[PDB]
Design an enzyme around this catalytic site. Structure first.
Site, PDB file in Angstrom:
ATOM      1  N   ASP A   1     -17.906  21.187   6.615  1.00 18.61           N
ATOM      2  CA  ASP A   1     -17.438  19.732   6.918  1.00 18.61           C
ATOM      3  C   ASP A   1     -18.186  19.080   8.193  1.00 18.61           C
ATOM      4  OD1 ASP A   1     -15.631  17.545   6.957  1.00 18.61           O
ATOM      5  OD2 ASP A   1     -14.142  18.477   8.003  1.00 18.61           O
TER       6      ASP A   1
ATOM      7  N   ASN B   1     -11.540  24.146   8.135  1.00 15.30           N
ATOM      8  CA  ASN B   1     -13.104  24.206   8.158  1.00 15.30           C
ATOM      9  C   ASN B   1     -13.705  25.303   8.152  1.00 15.30           C
ATOM     10  OD1 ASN B   1     -13.312  20.941   9.866  1.00 15.30           O
ATOM     11  ND2 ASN B   1     -12.957  21.266   7.537  1.00 15.30           N
TER      12      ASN B   1
ATOM     13  N   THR C   1      -8.914  16.807  13.933  1.00 16.11           N
ATOM     14  CA  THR C   1      -7.603  17.268  13.799  1.00 16.11           C
ATOM     15  C   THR C   1      -6.747  17.297  15.007  1.00 16.11           C
ATOM     16  OG1 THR C   1      -8.136  18.265  11.637  1.00 16.11           O
ATOM     17  CG2 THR C   1      -5.808  18.746  12.562  1.00 16.11           C
TER      18      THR C   1
ATOM     19  N   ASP D   1     -14.748  19.054  14.777  1.00 19.30           N
ATOM     20  CA  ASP D   1     -13.715  18.981  13.875  1.00 19.30           C
ATOM     21  C   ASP D   1     -13.543  20.338  13.449  1.00 19.30           C
ATOM     22  OD1 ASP D   1     -11.097  18.212  12.841  1.00 19.30           O
ATOM     23  OD2 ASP D   1     -12.162  17.587  11.239  1.00 19.30           O
TER      24      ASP D   1
ATOM     25  N   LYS E   1     -11.839  23.859  12.889  1.00 18.48           N
ATOM     26  CA  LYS E   1     -10.268  24.334  12.741  1.00 18.48           C
ATOM     27  C   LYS E   1     -10.288  25.258  11.558  1.00 18.48           C
ATOM     28  CE  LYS E   1      -9.886  19.919  10.038  1.00 18.48           C
ATOM     29  NZ  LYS E   1      -8.996  19.130   9.301  1.00 18.48           N
TER      30      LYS E   1
HETATM   31  N1  LIG Z   1     -17.812  24.966  -0.183  1.00 19.23           N
HETATM   32  C1  LIG Z   1     -16.618  24.915  -0.613  1.00 19.23           C
HETATM   33  N2  LIG Z   1     -16.121  26.059  -1.480  1.00 19.23           N
HETATM   34  C2  LIG Z   1     -14.889  26.297  -1.873  1.00 19.23           C
HETATM   35  N3  LIG Z   1     -13.995  25.260  -1.384  1.00 19.23           N
HETATM   36  C3  LIG Z   1     -14.447  24.282  -0.797  1.00 19.23           C
HETATM   37  C4  LIG Z   1     -15.710  24.186  -0.447  1.00 19.23           C
HETATM   38  N4  LIG Z   1     -15.917  22.913   0.403  1.00 19.23           N
HETATM   39  C5  LIG Z   1     -14.676  22.281   0.484  1.00 19.23           C
HETATM   40  N5  LIG Z   1     -13.725  23.160  -0.095  1.00 19.23           N
HETATM   41  C6  LIG Z   1     -12.250  22.951  -0.185  1.00 19.23           C
HETATM   42  O1  LIG Z   1     -12.297  21.530  -0.934  1.00 19.23           O
HETATM   43  C7  LIG Z   1     -11.429  20.826   0.027  1.00 19.23           C
HETATM   44  C8  LIG Z   1     -11.690  19.256   0.423  1.00 19.23           C
HETATM   45  O2  LIG Z   1     -12.850  19.075   0.893  1.00 19.23           O
HETATM   46  P1  LIG Z   1     -13.484  17.792   1.244  1.00 19.23           P
HETATM   47  O3  LIG Z   1     -14.628  17.827   2.104  1.00 19.23           O
HETATM   48  O4  LIG Z   1     -13.760  17.047  -0.271  1.00 19.23           O
HETATM   49  O5  LIG Z   1     -12.201  16.808   1.896  1.00 19.23           O
HETATM   50  P2  LIG Z   1     -11.680  17.494   3.226  1.00 19.23           P
HETATM   51  O6  LIG Z   1     -12.992  17.218   4.178  1.00 19.23           O
HETATM   52  O7  LIG Z   1     -10.832  18.627   3.068  1.00 19.23           O
HETATM   53  O8  LIG Z   1     -10.754  16.393   3.634  1.00 19.23           O
HETATM   54  P3  LIG Z   1     -11.135  15.005   4.253  1.00 19.23           P
HETATM   55  O9  LIG Z   1     -12.562  14.719   4.109  1.00 19.23           O
HETATM   56  O10 LIG Z   1     -10.160  13.791   4.116  1.00 19.23           O
HETATM   57  O11 LIG Z   1     -10.983  15.193   5.927  1.00 19.23           O
HETATM   58  C9  LIG Z   1     -11.391  21.625   1.350  1.00 19.23           C
HETATM   59  O12 LIG Z   1     -10.349  21.448   2.171  1.00 19.23           O
HETATM   60  C10 LIG Z   1     -11.539  22.844   0.969  1.00 19.23           C
HETATM   61  O13 LIG Z   1     -10.287  23.501   0.602  1.00 19.23           O
END
Ligand SMILES: Nc1ncnc2c1ncn2[C@@H]1O[C@H](COP(=O)(O)OP(=O)(O)OP(=O)(O)O)[C@@H](O)[C@H]1O
Ligand SMILES: Nc1ncnc2c1ncn2[C@@H]1O[C@H](COP(=O)(O)OP(=O)(O)OP(=O)(O)O)[C@@H](O)[C@H]1O
Lengths: 285, 285
Positions: free
Chosen positions: B153, B140, B171, B135, B137
């Site tokens: 991710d 990520n 995606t 995934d 992108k």
């Molecule tokens: N380590 C990090 N540091 C800063 N920001 C982060 C970090 N990890 C994630 N984020 C931010 O938080 C958002 C949400 O992350 P999360 O894994 O909770 O859900 P997601 O993967 O974006 O969505 P989903 O899991 O439904 O596909 C990310 O899109 C990113 O913008």
């Protein structure tokens, strides 16, 4: 839970020797797969066994693995081959705090206060985990690329369980009186070292100096030292509250009600203790 | 070997929400004892179990624990209370790479080359461990305070053992044709995503776009896209060697003899691959 594969010598490109000890040699190494630089401490197993240092090397590894604070050298990994043990440590680019003391002679009040505060903060964390350093000194207080401290050298630390001790005696100029009289060590022993270090930062030289060790110990048990006229008043008052023969009367010790009173000392009036490592260190002279 | 004590919610002062997902919420947190900032991903156990996401959450943790490279978000610790799981992750201060693509429209050749090189380097490391992201992108690919990438991710990653796959589809705009035709995924699937990302960096928009997913998939299996006139020539040639329907013919895949030929592509002529994370990233426009 799964962890990265055990690293090996071939994963690195070793460079210059950063330091040499009696049972180890620290070498700068660049990990090929990441280009990351680590200070790898290499210890020969045979020598360690011959001199009965297994308890010390084991303690160094165990203590460092328990530390997770910005003011301490970090142990990232360990591995070994047939003859040597390898400890992957954070690379403190700016070297020993002692280097800077010698370089500029002595620290002004602002720099003294800042670095003393970081050391005090590091000790609060260390002591909070029931660990006594036992050999705290400028040589053991390294500086990272951002000029924040990184304390190291834990093989000779003492992990409390009850504050009993005995067995090891750190660098003569920083040895506490209890080690020379009762042959015992406690958290307060580190506070005594702190007092010597603060004095050294301000005066440019440690409090107790002499031609040999016997003479230094002699001055220590008699609390034989004095302050130069210039010495910052509040810093002097603090040192006098740390270099106290009775270990139970040193500012910061448990009998004196801990770190609260120490951090509240007038010398640290303008210090914000919550985020020191996020602050920009004052430029050294 | 002993490790630090298990951390808990009370050890932190939680702040703003950094992001929200379907099974988790990432919150900025400051560890009280160190003042260190971590991005803590919080996942409700009940919800995870209800939607049968245990394999995914477990994989995320396991994969991240195996990664030890500067271009990946790091997992420092984990803990849980009665209702939630907490993953302590590195805090990528500058957010998503997508943010910058939208901010400046598109990257010049220097910035495209630099960031593409870091992504390629990250994938070489990832693939070297038999892990497929699945995934990949701009969303990520996060950016740390120094503007170097930090890919994240991994719950939906695939850990190879033999390159079988199937089950998850990333995606839409970055989905490889094999996932839509054979319902399978391999390392090369990530290279296809790489091709879309390079195209997006240069054009400002991903290659395959349409009103809905069905239409996007339709364009993907027919390799229906084209390059705008301006497109950097060498970058175009690279993308054409990545967006290839036959997964065994994508530059960088095992059948094409790996990362050597990919890193040797003309577009990366002036790139020094050994220490990208030690280089100063070009300023974005
Ligand atoms: N380590 C990090 N540091 C800063 N920001 C982060 C970090 N990890 C994630 N984020 C931010 O938080 C958002 C949400 O992350 P999360 O894994 O909770 O859900 P997601 O993967 O974006 O969505 P989903 O899991 O439904 O596909 C990310 O899109 C990113 O913008
Ligand atoms: N993590 C590090 N980063 C940079 N330099 C280091 C690091 N650790 C140690 N050094 C340097 O290497 C030197 C030697 O360290 P080592 O632990 O091998 O022996 P030592 O403790 O100095 O001496 P001994 O163990 O005999 O008392 C240190 O004095 C210091 O100058």
């Amino acid at each position: 839970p799964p962890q990265p594969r055990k690293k090996r010598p071939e994963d690195f490109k070793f460079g210059k020797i950063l330091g040499e000890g009696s049972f180890s040699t620290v070498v700068l190494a660049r990990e090929l797969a990441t280009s990351r630089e680590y200070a790898i401490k290499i210890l020969e197993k045979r020598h360690i066994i011959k001199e009965n240092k297994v308890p010390y090397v084991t303690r160094e590894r165990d203590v460092m693995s328990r530390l997770d604070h910005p003011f301490f050298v970090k142990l990232y990994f360990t591995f070994q081959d047939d003859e040597k043990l390898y400890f992957g440590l954070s690379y403190a680019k700016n070297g020993e705090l002692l280097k800077y003391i010698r370089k500029i002679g002595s620290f002004d009040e602002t720099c003294t206060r800042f670095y003393t505060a970081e050391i005090v903060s590091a000790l609060e964390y260390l002591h909070g985990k029931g660990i006594i350093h036992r050999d705290l000194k400028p040589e053991n207080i390294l500086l990272n690329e951002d000029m924040h401290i990184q304390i190291t050298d834990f093989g000779t630390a003492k992990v409390l369980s009850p504050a009993r001790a005995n067995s090891f005696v750190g660098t003569a100029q920083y040895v506490s009186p209890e080690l020379l009289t009762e042959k015992s060590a406690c958290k307060s022993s580190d506070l005594w070292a702190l007092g010597c270090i603060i004095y050294q930062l301000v005066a440019g030289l440690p409090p107790f100096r002499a031609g040999n060790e016997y003479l230094i110990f002699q001055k220590i048990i008699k609390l034989e030292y004095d302050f130069p006229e210039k010495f910052f008043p509040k810093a002097r008052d603090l040192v006098e509250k740390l270099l106290v023969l009775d270990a139970t009367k040193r500012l910061g010790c448990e009998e004196m009600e801990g770190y609260g009173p120490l951090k509240a000392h007038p010398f640290f009036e303008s210090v914000t203790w919550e985020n020191l490592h996020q602050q920009t260190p004052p430029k050294l002279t």
